[model samples]
Target: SAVISLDEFENKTLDEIIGFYEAQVLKLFYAEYPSTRKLAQRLGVSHTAIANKLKQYGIGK
Candidate 1:
């Protein structure tokens, strides 16, 4: 599978895409086997960016 791209959706808001990714993809992998750096590499974002967002879900640091 390919990592998601901002270009994947034309005219989509950043929030919308990330929301879809978070709910559909991240939530499952975030707990128990949490690894922001690995996810960042695949997601193509900075690790801290992913971690910062994850905190918004109250998923912890």
Candidate 2:
């Protein structure tokens, strides 16, 4: 289903669930702003991590 039902995350580790949701939120942010430093701050991660995630998603130059 397109909806992200809460039940599906129950069995996953907290870190797994957090990681999944973080990426989803980041995708939205990156689509609009595309700034690694800003995104890292928002996500509470390092800028390099944000840059790596962008590359993983085939985003940015």
Candidate 3:
């Protein structure tokens, strides 16, 4: 399935949009192949940020 676009989230609060994409990133993070480093690059953030989010969502190894 496709991810929700920013336009679709126009009614949501800024925090809500961030949370939505955070969960989506975690889903992709666990889906396979890509390392956290790679995922971070694709997501345009630091790997540390990705790692922190994983832990915040309680899915860190």
The predictions' CA RMSDs to the true structure, in order, are: 6.3, 6.9, 6.1
lDDT string, candidate 2, 1-61, tens digits: 2333333432322233344564554465466545766655554556676667655765544
lDDT of 1 by residue, 1-61 (tens): 3355433422232244566565544564355235876655545566677667765766536
Q: What is candidate 2's CA lDDT for residue 8?
A: 42
Assess each prediction's global lDDT (C-alpha) against the native.
0.53, 0.50, 0.53
Model 2 TM-score relative to the real fold: 0.48
Per-prediction backbone clash count:
0, 0, 0
Residue 36 shift from truth in candidate 3, angstroms: 0.9
Which residue pairs show collisions in model 2? none
Q: Model 2: which ten-residue window has the lowest total lDDT?
A: 5-14
Worst 10 residues of 3 by lDDT: 6-15
lDDT tens per residue, model 3, 5-52: 423433333243456565764655545416767655544556676667
Q: What is the lDDT of residue 57 in candidate 1?
A: 68
Error of 3 at 40 (Å): 0.2
Rank the candidate models, highest lDDT first: 1, 3, 2
Listed in order, each prediction's TM-score against the native is 0.52, 0.48, 0.52
Model 1 stretches astray by more than 4 angstroms: 1-16, 29-33
Output the better candidate (2/3) by lDDT: 3
